[PDB]
């Protein structure tokens, strides 16, 4: 289905630098059109996100569309395999749905015939102007096998690193996930951030989801019993129990590889 996503910047913990860069990348064409006319700037057509899984690349693509009040179309890389006109029809539908964000997920899978489902993608991008109001976003978990042809000017304009959350970011992710939940006052999220070094954003969300379930199942059972004869909260002890099916999903070795890739691009 095609729709404007509900996720906002507020749902995304950390990545504050990345967020104002993306805002500037899309707010500037419509907030200062006179200066965009004055100097000859063409709006950006695309970005490529990279980093470990579960750290917010999909969330950021949906928040960009929500900011622009734009439709969102998602395509996972493995599913363009049956048929090179598959690529042509997706760009048609995105153009039909303009203004629109077109998100290519799991692009590392086609980075490994398939040789130019790629060329088709590259040609569709070259043949589409910024006047069509379609903004393209790709995401990958394997930045080592990016064909640099997709980063040439006129295609995806910027490669952007989306890293594992640091300690400050882990507090923000917990707070964003819990922003509309009733959390007991004995819950110390800064201490939970201290104890989750190396956790991804998806890893943190599971802890919150397990603690919230445990609370619901407590609420269910206690009213079942009080029947035999006041909004409840997620308490510290629900979080205590959730945290021992809690472990990192990204290895220390993959973390080293991402950090090396990113640090060498300064
Ligand atoms: N920065 C973040 N802030 C808040 N939640 C996050 C963040 N990163 C990941 N999550 C949680 O993990 C889930 C997966 O994130 P996603 O953006 O799909 O990861 P990927 O980087 O693999 O695209 C999200 O739905 C959300 O619950
Ligand atoms: N097993 C997953 C995996 C990840 C990587 C990798 C390679 C380069 C940079 C970052 C990550 N190589 O393999
Ligand atoms: Na990923």
Task: Give the integer Cα–Cα distance in Å for 88 and 120.
Answer: 7
DSSP H/E element including 62 = helix 57-67
Burial 241-252 (b: 16+ CB within 10 A, else e): ebeeebeeebee
Name 22's Cβ contacts closer than 8 Å, sequence gap at least 6: 47, 60, 63, 64
Task: Give the integer Cα–Cα distance in Å for 150 and 5.
Answer: 26
Resolution of the entry in angstroms: 1.9
The secondary structure of 93-157 as a DSSP string is HHHHT-SEEEEEE-GGGTT--GGGHHHHHHHHHHT--GGG-EEEEEEES-GGG--GGGGSTTS--
The secondary structure of 160-224 as a DSSP string is EE-PPP-HHHHHHHHHHHTTTS-B-TT--HHHHHHTTTT--HHHHHHHHHHHHHHHHHHHHHHHH
- Residue among 176, 205, 212, 250 whose CB has most ligand 1 atoms within 8 A, to mutate: 205
Phi/psi for 257 (5° steps) reads: -65, -45
- The closest ligand to the CA of 141 turns out to be 3
CA distances from 4 to 63, 85, 222 (A): 9, 26, 40
Strand partners, 262: none
Q: Residue 134: how many CA atoms within 13 Å on its side-chain side?
A: 21
What angle (nearest 5°) sits at the alpha carbon of residue 47, between those of residues 41 and 51? 150
Q: Answer yes or no: is the C-beta of 56 below 6 A from any ligand 1 atom.
A: yes
Q: Which two structure tokens, joined as six digits, stand for 160?
A: 């952007």
Task: Give the integer Cα–Cα distance in Å for 219 and 117.
Answer: 52
Contact predicate 201/220, CB 8 Å: no
Nearest CA to ligand 1 atom 17: 56
Tell me how the structure was determined: X-ray
Task: Give the integer Cα–Cα distance in Å for 28 and 40.
Answer: 13
| 264 annotated as ligand-binding | no
Nearest CA to ligand 1 atom 26: 202
Prior bond of 99 cis (ω within 30°): yes
The secondary structure of 230-255 as a DSSP string is ----B-HHHHHHHTTS---SS-HHHH
Task: Map out the domains of the chain with their CATH numbers.
Answer: 1-164 (3.40.50.300), 165-266 (1.10.8.60)
Q: Answer yes or no: is the C-beta of 54 below 6 A from any ligand 1 atom.
A: yes
Contact predicate 13/176, CB 8 Å: yes
Task: Give the integer Cα–Cα distance in Å for 201 and 207.
Answer: 10
DSSP H/E element including 225 = helix 201-226
Name 177's Cβ contacts closer than 8 Å, sequence gap at least 6: 13, 204, 205, 208
Nearest CA to ligand 2 atom 4: 254
Say how many Å lie between the CA of residue 257 and the centre of ligand 2.
6
Q: Sign (positive/negative) of CA torsion 242, 202, 12, 21?
A: positive
């Amino acid at each position: 289905v095609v729709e404007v996503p509900q996720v906002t910047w507020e749902d995304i913990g950390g990545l504050e630098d990345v967020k104002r860069e993306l805002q500037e990348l899309v707010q500037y064409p419509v907030e200062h059109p006179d200066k965009f006319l004055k100097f000859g700037m063409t709006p950006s057509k695309g970005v490529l996100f990279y980093g470990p899984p579960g750290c917010g690349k999909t969330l950021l693509a949906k928040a960009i569309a929500n900011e622009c009040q734009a439709n969102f179309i998602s395509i996972k890389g493995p599913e363009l395999l049956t048929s090179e006109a598959n690529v042509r029809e997706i760009f048609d539908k995105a153009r039909q749905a303009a203004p629109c964000v077109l998100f290519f997920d799991e692009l590392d899978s086609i980075a490994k015939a398939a040789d130019r489902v790629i060329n088709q993608i590259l040609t569709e991008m070259d043949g589409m102007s910024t006047k069509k109001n379609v903004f393209i976003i790709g995401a990958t978990n394997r930045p080592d096998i990016i064909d640099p042809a997709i980063l040439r000017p006129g295609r995806l304009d910027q490669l952007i690193y989306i890293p594992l959350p640091d300690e400050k970011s882990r507090v923000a992710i917990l707070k964003a996930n819990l922003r509309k939940s009733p959390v007991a006052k004995d819950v110390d999220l800064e201490f939970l951030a201290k104890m989750t070094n190396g956790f991804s954003g998806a890893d943190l969300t599971e802890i919150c989801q397990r603690a919230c379930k445990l609370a619901i199942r407590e609420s269910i059972e206690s009213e079942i019993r009080r029947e035999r004869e006041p909004v409840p909260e997620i308490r510290r002890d629900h979080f205590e129990e959730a945290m021992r099916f809690a472990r990192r999903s990204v290895s220390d070795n993959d973390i080293r590889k991402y950090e090396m890739f990113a640090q060498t691009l300064q």
